[PDB]
Amino acid sequence: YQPTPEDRFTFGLWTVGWQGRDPFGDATRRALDPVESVRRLAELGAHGVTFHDDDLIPFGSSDSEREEHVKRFRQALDDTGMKVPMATTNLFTHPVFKDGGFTANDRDVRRYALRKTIRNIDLAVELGAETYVAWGGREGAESGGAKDVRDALDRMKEAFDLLGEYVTSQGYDIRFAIEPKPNEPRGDILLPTVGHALAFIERLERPELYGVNPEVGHEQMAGLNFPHGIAQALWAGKLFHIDLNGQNGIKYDQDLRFGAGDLRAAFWLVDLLESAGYSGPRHFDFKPPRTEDFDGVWASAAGCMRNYLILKERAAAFRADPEVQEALRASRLDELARPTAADGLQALLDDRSAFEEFDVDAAAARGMAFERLDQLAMDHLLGA
Amino acid sequence: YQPTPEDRFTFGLWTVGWQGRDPFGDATRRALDPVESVRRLAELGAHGVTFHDDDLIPFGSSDSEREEHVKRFRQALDDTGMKVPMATTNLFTHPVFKDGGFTANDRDVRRYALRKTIRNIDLAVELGAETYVAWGGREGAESGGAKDVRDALDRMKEAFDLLGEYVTSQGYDIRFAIEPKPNEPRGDILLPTVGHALAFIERLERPELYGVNPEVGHEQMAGLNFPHGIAQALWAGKLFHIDLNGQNGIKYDQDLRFGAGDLRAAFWLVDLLESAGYSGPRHFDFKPPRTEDFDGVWASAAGCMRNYLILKERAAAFRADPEVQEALRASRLDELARPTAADGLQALLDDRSAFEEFDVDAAAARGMAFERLDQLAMDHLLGA
Amino acid sequence: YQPTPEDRFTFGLWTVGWQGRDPFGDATRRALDPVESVRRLAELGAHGVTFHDDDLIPFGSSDSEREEHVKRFRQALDDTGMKVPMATTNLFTHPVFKDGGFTANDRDVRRYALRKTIRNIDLAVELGAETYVAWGGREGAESGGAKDVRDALDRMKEAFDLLGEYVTSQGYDIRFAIEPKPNEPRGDILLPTVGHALAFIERLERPELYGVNPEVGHEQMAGLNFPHGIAQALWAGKLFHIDLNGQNGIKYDQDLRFGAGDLRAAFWLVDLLESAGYSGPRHFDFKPPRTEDFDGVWASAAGCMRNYLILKERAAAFRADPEVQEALRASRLDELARPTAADGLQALLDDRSAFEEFDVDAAAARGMAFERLDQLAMDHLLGA
Amino acid sequence: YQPTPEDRFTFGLWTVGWQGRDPFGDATRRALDPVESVRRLAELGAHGVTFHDDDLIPFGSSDSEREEHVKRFRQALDDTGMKVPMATTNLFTHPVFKDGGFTANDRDVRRYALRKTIRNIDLAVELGAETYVAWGGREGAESGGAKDVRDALDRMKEAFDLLGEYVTSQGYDIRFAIEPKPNEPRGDILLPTVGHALAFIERLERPELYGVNPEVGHEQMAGLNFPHGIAQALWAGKLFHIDLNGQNGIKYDQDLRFGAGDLRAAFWLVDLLESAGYSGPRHFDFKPPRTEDFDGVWASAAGCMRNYLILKERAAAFRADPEVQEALRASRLDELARPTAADGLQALLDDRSAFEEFDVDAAAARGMAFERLDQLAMDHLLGA
Ligand SMILES: [Mg+2]
Ligand SMILES: [Mg+2]
Ligand SMILES: [Mg+2]
Ligand SMILES: [Mg+2]
């Protein structure tokens, strides 16, 4: 289960670089130089890294400090063969964004958040990123009167439309991926799920430029089925990026390593990505727990990739097993994939087998055989 | 707080008619004749009722039994002045639908579910309904291998497209409203939230024919903010119906009377519907607890309407209060409603006030004043 | 992974006998004769069955019907070698219990619930049960004014004290196990978690006669860590019974087969029961999904046992692995098991190494090595 | 609704002093001098303040710095008439406590956490505190192998027993209050609910010295009914302190002002505390949102008290209303308070009215009238 470049495993600088500050605790690790993280990730077999503007260039840097930070980072990339497939903006840490970036009630802040984004889009393109993620973690409210959501959606649409006009005007080959989250750090976050983000995108001026960046734990924070949401994003053609991690249920976002948290959901996720031929990076947005020293940071990162590869092997064995293929037919998964009424409306209307002569009790007596199928899946997952 | 016809309060037959069977208990009340429910609802000041096919006509009825059931119901409507604004299909109770209607793995069941729906669309139109709700409560799975979600979405789209072709072919003035729910009775339900349903609709052949029917408790079963989801549905132009009830958090769907459960969310909901000028029925999809006799059924139904009207009064007083209007300005709600960059992209790019000369620390020092605004809202809700 | 009598796997009659009625659906399977269930369970390698009074004897049976039902059941037990280690009362299905049994507001109902219980305690003893479970599924409320909880706890204590006096008066060797659940079918259930039940027991007149019967899914309905709660019950000496099943998070109680739901929690549960030498039955309180026919019922039941045995093997391999034993020492699990201050209070107070000369920064620099330990656990679970 | 000294409203220094750092954001407010907070709280009508050691004396202070900090604080208390009824230890912020204080796997850390606690117990007594809270926010785990919970409970018991021996040895009139929380900042926290804490206390050497400090939002993080848990703590005689705030469901702990979050639960809480004659401080453990400036901090704190007093008035009006008193009798709340079987076991056994001659169908036909009672409660809460 050793990673390869074709596995396309990628990590955010802020993942392994998380110093361990939480709502109730100070940092437990020193800050990492991005150069060190690139080298250590490469050694573990990662293919690339990602960044927020502020992870790579300290907020408020002069042009000369900006250039030096980028130069050093690029040297580490060149030294290792690491790629930068995705970048994003920090529109959440600085106090100025306490009510939002794109949907701050203050218009001056909205305009600033756009200009900060556009600056980093240019950098992302310089570094070869083809995806630009937007996580509006400050967009939302703790109280009902604070945020008129229709007006906030109008501002959010205006912001993303301006970004689309910008990339089009520059001739860039970069696309956007909107990352939903239901809550945390705001009491409620706007576009709280994959579904709300997909629906929003369809209202944009240039919807082809935007997809989703779903994150395992984010959908699980609302108790939703992550594989199901990924399926709807694939069905819509909008899975432009994915963030992989673990989460134990409906609680604060834990950002556990991938494979931890809901292991069976991880299995069905990998099965779906691999069956569908998803071609994007397998990006980990996780935090090594603050209990760990740097050895444990690198162990946790390695574990992300390892668990993906173990699950990949088990899912492939499941799908290739003739006994599972038989059980899939026994449960009529083949029939689910066939059109209900390719004969057309009128033919359906005229078909007595669909109504007057449909034997409902005979149909109801048929078992689905789902339990035997699921125990085959369990046996395969556990290597039993 | 006495209801009027213009309040347009409506109830499902299955609400006040719920006999009290639950996962662990037998019925505690006798079945109600729909005629009795129409009369009792009218006496309380309801404006209309709604129905599933099977609530009005016992499943498996002959044509003559069907006609008699409808005739009696229509007499009660005529006797009372009650309307029937919405109808829906039962595609969940009968064992034949144990794996779904429109997305059953068995194709024969899918075709039958369409024919059952189309039959009741014709009835709905005969009774003057302008909305047809679809709640796919059996669409989904308990296990991962049981349901390929992309194939199920293809079947779901095919079904709704056929229904759209049917209504168009008949020249009917009826539109569809898809009701999301995240889980229960399936482990996970397809289209689990307002967002997923909105996104799905945009993929239909005739998207103008479909909206959402959000239900208070359903979105709260995923821990989501119901007012926020209603706002996104209004923003999209897709709020075709609403189902009102109460829910205490993330648990089994409780179907409490409206106002019970999350009272502050109920307040912000009413504020939003009334401010936005929502024109549809205020429909209650609730269950009087099985602890109650029929006196308690009618009390619970009356309480639905009463709580809506109390909340309406308090929300209107909030919005009309000059002190609240001042607090809204103090929190910059007026600025949220103004375009970020009506000057355009290039002007924003050229505006040093948005970047080089934006004083981030001065902007960050500004309080939002959200707590004072929310305590005004609390004072108004409580009549303090 | 084939079950043996020493595995002591047991099943409730109402598990495999669940006909499939849910909040939104009719039965999908015919009722099973208890005799058939005993025979089929035995064939799968179960060691015993359990029952509610009403599962074995139809409610309202004459004395002669009661005797015949028991006679047939006993013949099936004798024919198979199956045991009956536990019994319980149905104080939830009949409408009379809609506000509770032991804590019904009506005193007449409370007295009846005690008499119904005592009758079945005598039967349980006749059948050789050594544990008597009490699940107060109707004890609680949907609204705040309905149930004064201090008065209800007084009634609950009075009821359990009377049962204790009864068993003591008869000289029976049976003990009670109180089964917590947080909600469903009441909005909130009294004694909602293992902790609340443990605390309650300590207030009883004869606390040695009562323990807990924790159920996997019940604690997971409150988002709690089931292994942790089992650990506290073991620490208290109060784990008198356990109910095994699966649950996917905070939602309606799903009663999935054991191993489904939170698989990693299942692994840590089995590890804990086996490490602690738990000696009671491994009882499954689950429902084969209503999608299944009887073949799927028996498959689901077999899967319960299979998953327990796979997990047992993997947990034992984890604990026996010298690399894991080393990692446990590296994470200081050995030190957690050593007294903080066996030297005593005054010695601790006088120990400068505990205060003035404790190097907090050196201590804080030490990693816990928990991630490497957990990835060993993951590798073992998956057989990697 | 203006606060008075007899209202006994108290606040933690860390509440109004929270600078606004969260998992994704820097501070938005400057640090407050404790002196300023005492004066501002007093002006709003608070009666007292509380503290962690580290809120009053910067961690690592010399003896002279410690004395000066305490002297200034005491002057502010004397200047205002503010009391200090409760104190507590910070055993969570410093990296040394990343795996716990009392249950850290490292024994040296456990001993240090005891010595840090004991130092501040002496200070608490000097300042006149009669309650000493313990919130073990770092006690727990993210992974299953990291923490043997039985061993951790042994260490937790050892620690609390040593603290009990210490206070007894000094002749102090201070008692302990253990504050449960289910998760955050650990993945799972030990003693996660009121129930688990109550049960734990009964195992201590001197259980009379310990009670619980339940917090509204903490129990609501597990989806539990806070009023119900407070009722069980009162029933046990163990409500030694309470922490008041708001929470919107099962999510990260929000620490909203009291009255926000679940307003109806707040109403039933106040009703219960006032009806039971709870005599302790009404302590607010909340955080003014980081959106606010200092004006909003003081507004949020004022709102805590205001909402308590509005709710107190409405609950008292509910209980005094003859119509509610009649509805309580109609729902048999009076009968819930009467013993089930003061006649004794044998009399119950011999009572045919409890069994052979109990008319179950007549009893089941009786409505509980809970909906009318709850709508009276709603009407009273809203002043309708
Ligand atoms: Mg992410
Ligand atoms: Mg509905
Ligand atoms: Mg059970
Ligand atoms: Mg607290």
Whether omega for the bond prior to residue D281 falls within 30 degrees of 0, making it cis, is no
Instruction: Kindly list the partner chains of chain A, i.e. chains with 3 or more CB atom pairs below 8 Å.
Output: B, C, D
Exposed/middle/buried for D69, CB within 10 Å: 0-12, 13-18, 19+?
A: middle
Strand B175-178 with B131-134, pairing? parallel
Whether A96 sits inside 8 A of B364 (CB atoms) is yes
Whether A183 sits inside 8 A of D251 (CB atoms) is yes
Q: What DSSP state is assigned to residue C103? A: T
Residue in the block written with tokens 């990590």: A11
| Residue type at D116 in one-letter notation | K
CA of A194 relative to ligand 2 center, distance in Å: 22
The nearest alpha carbon in chain C to A246 belongs to C264
Whether B268 contacts D343, CB under 8 Å: no
Name the closest ligand to CA C212: 3
Structural domain tally of chain B? 1
CA-based end-to-end distance of chain B: 18
CA of A217 relative to ligand 4 center, distance in Å: 26
Smallest Cβ–Cβ distance between A95 and the set D23, D26, D97 belongs to D26
Resolution (A): 1.4
Q: What DSSP state is assigned to residue B260? A: B
The nearest alpha carbon in chain D to B376 belongs to D303
The Cα B314–Cα B333 span in angstroms is 20
C59 at interface of B, judged by CB pairs closer than 8 A: no
Q: Smallest CA–CA separation between C375 and chain A, in Å?
A: 7
| Interior angle at CA C256, CA A218 and CA A381, nearest 5 | 70
The H-or-E segment that residue A188 falls in is: strand A188-189
Smallest Cβ–Cβ distance between A98 and the set D28, D183, D254 belongs to D28
The Cα D115–Cα B360 span in angstroms is 44
Structural domain of D269? 1-384
D263 at interface of B, judged by CB pairs closer than 8 A: yes
D218 is in an annotated binding site: yes
Q: Smallest CA–CA separation between B308 and chain A, in Å?
A: 17
Whole-angstrom CA distances from A251 to A221, C250, D226 are 6, 10, 18
Strand partners, A256: A246
Whether C98 sits inside 8 A of B25 (CB atoms) is yes
Choice among D53, D54, D55, D99 that is catalytic: D55
Choice among A53, A54, A55, A262 that is catalytic: A55
Whether D146 sits inside 8 A of C368 (CB atoms) is yes
By annotation, the residues of C acting in catalysis are 52, 55
Task: Return the number of CB contacts < 8 Å for B and C.
Answer: 107
Task: Return the number of CB contacts < 8 Å for C and D.
Answer: 328
Residues in chain C: 384
Locate breaks in chain B with C to N over 2.5 A; list the residue preceding each. Answer: none
Instruction: Look at residues B302, A334, A248, D14 and name the one whose alpha carbon lies nearest to residue C228.
Output: A248
The Cα B337–Cα B354 span in angstroms is 19
Smallest Cβ–Cβ distance between C112 and the set D112, D115, D354 belongs to D354
D261 at interface of A, judged by CB pairs closer than 8 A: no
Q: How many CA atoms lie within 13 A of D215 on its CB side?
A: 26
Name D379's Cβ contacts closer than 8 Å, sequence gap at least 6: none
Q: Which of residues 196-235 of D touch A (CB under 8 A)?
A: 221
The Cα D31–Cα A261 span in angstroms is 37
The Cα C46–Cα A324 span in angstroms is 26
Whether D296 sits inside 8 A of B263 (CB atoms) is no
Q: Smallest CA–CA separation between A273 and chain D, in Å?
A: 27
Whole-angstrom CA distances from C157 to A355, A369, C205, C243 are 57, 45, 9, 23
C253 is in an annotated binding site: yes
Whether B98 sits inside 8 A of C22 (CB atoms) is no
Instruction: Look at residues C80, C26, D127 and name the one whose alpha carbon lies nearest to residue B60.
Output: C26
Which stretches does DSSP call E strand in B103-254?
131-134, 140-141, 175-178, 188-189, 210-212, 243-244
Supply φ then ψ for residue A291, to 5 degrees: -60, -25
Instruction: Collect residues with CB below 5 Å from ion ligand 1.
Output: A 215, 243, 285
| Residue type at C156 in one-letter notation | M
Find the Cα–Cα–Cα–Cα dihedral D139, D142, D144, D146, rounded to 10°.
-60
The Cα A281–Cα B217 span in angstroms is 37
Torsion sign (Cα): C330, C332, C335, C341: positive
Whether B141 contacts B186, CB under 8 Å: yes
Smallest Cβ–Cβ distance between C337 and the set D151, D340, D358 belongs to D151
Choice among B53, B54, B55, B271 that is catalytic: B55
Q: Which of residues 349-368 of D touch C (CB under 8 A)?
A: 349, 351, 353-355, 358, 360-361, 363-364, 366, 368
Whether C197 sits inside 8 A of D200 (CB atoms) is no
The nearest alpha carbon in chain D to A136 belongs to D24
- Helix H, strand E, coil C: the string for C149-209 is HHHHHHHHHHHHHHHHHHHHHHCCCCEEEECCCCCCCCCEECCCCHHHHHHHHCCCCCHHH
Whether A285 contacts A243, CB under 8 Å: yes
Whether A9 contacts A304, CB under 8 Å: yes
Instruction: Look at residues A181, A303, A197, A178 and name the one whose alpha carbon lies nearest to residue A254.
Output: A181
Whether B368 sits inside 8 A of D249 (CB atoms) is no
Strand D9-12 with C131-134, pairing? unpaired
Secondary structure of residue D247 in the 3-state scheme: coil
The Cα C72–Cα C85 span in angstroms is 18
CA of D89 relative to ligand 4 center, distance in Å: 12
Supply φ then ψ for residue D125, to 5 degrees: -60, -45
B215 is in an annotated binding site: yes
Smallest Cβ–Cβ distance between D348 and the set C115, C153, C364 belongs to C115
The Cα D91–Cα D97 span in angstroms is 6
Instruction: Look at residues D304, D224, D312, D241 and name the one whose alpha carbon lies nearest to residue D271.
Output: D312
> CATH code at C338?
3.20.20.150
D317 at interface of B, judged by CB pairs closer than 8 A: no
B192 at interface of A, judged by CB pairs closer than 8 A: yes
Name B214's Cβ contacts closer than 8 Å, sequence gap at least 6: B179, B180, B194, B226, B229, B230, B233, B239, B242, B243
The Cα D126–Cα B230 span in angstroms is 55
Is B334 annotated in the active site? no
The H-or-E segment that residue A213 falls in is: none
The Cα C128–Cα C134 span in angstroms is 17
Smallest Cβ–Cβ distance between D158 and the set C203, C276, C340 belongs to C340
The Cα D246–Cα D217 span in angstroms is 6
Experimentally, the structure was elucidated by: X-ray
Name the closest ligand to CA A283: 1
Q: Smallest CA–CA separation between B362 and chain A, in Å?
A: 9
Whether B340 sits inside 8 A of A158 (CB atoms) is yes
The H-or-E segment that residue C243 falls in is: strand C243-244
Q: How many CA atoms lie within 13 A of C236 on its CB side?
A: 31
Exposed/middle/buried for D74, CB within 10 Å: 0-12, 13-18, 19+?
A: middle
The Cα B221–Cα B250 span in angstroms is 5
Whether B58 contacts B65, CB under 8 Å: yes
Torsion sign (Cα): A359, A360, A365, A368: positive
The Cα B113–Cα B100 span in angstroms is 9
